[PDB]
C-alpha cells in the first residue's frame, strides 16, 4: 500500500510510454496513464 | 488536455474496479489504477 508519491513512482515504473530521462509532472503522468489504459483496453 | 481534476474524472470512467456507490479518495483511485494496469498487462502476456 502506497502513499501518493509511491503511487506516482509505481505508475512511472508501469507505463512504458513515459519519458525515460525527462522530468514528468503529475498531470503529464496521469495523461500518459489514461492513454495507456485506453490502448490496452482496445488491443485486448 | 485535462487538468488534474479532469484526469481523475477520466480515470474514474476508465477503471472498472472502482467502487460505484461511495466517495473515493485520490490515493484510492491511483491504487486501483495501478492494479488495473497490472491486470491488463498480465492479460496481454497470455
UniProtKB/Swiss-Prot annotation, chain B:
<comment type="subunit">
    <text>Heterodimer with other HLH proteins. Interacts with CLOCK and BMAL1. Interacts with COPS5, IFI204, GATA4 and NKX2-5.</text>
</comment>
<feature type="domain" description="bHLH">
    <location>
        <begin position="1"/>
        <end position="40"/>
    </location>
</feature>
<comment type="function">
    <text>Transcriptional regulator (lacking a basic DNA binding domain) which negatively regulates the basic helix-loop-helix (bHLH) transcription factors by forming heterodimers and inhibiting their DNA binding and transcriptional activity. Implicated in regulating a variety of cellular processes, including cellular growth, senescence, differentiation, apoptosis, angiogenesis, and neoplastic transformation. Inhibits skeletal muscle and cardiac myocyte differentiation. Regulates the circadian clock by repressing the transcriptional activator activity of the CLOCK-BMAL1 heterodimer.</text>
</comment>
<feature type="region of interest" description="Interaction with IFI204">
    <location>
        <begin position="1"/>
        <end position="46"/>
    </location>
</feature>
<feature type="short sequence motif" description="Nuclear export signal">
    <location>
        <begin position="33"/>
        <end position="46"/>
    </location>
</feature>
<protein>
    <recommendedName>
        <fullName>DNA-binding protein inhibitor ID-1</fullName>
    </recommendedName>
</protein>
Amino acid at each position: 500500500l502506497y502513499d501518493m508519491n509511491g503511487c506516482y513512482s509505481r505508475l512511472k515504473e508501469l507505463v512504458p510510454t513515459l519519458p525515460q530521462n525527462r522530468k514528468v509532472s503529475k498531470v503529464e503522468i496521469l495523461q500518459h496513464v489514461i492513454d495507456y489504459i485506453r490502448d490496452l483496453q482496445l488491443e485486448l
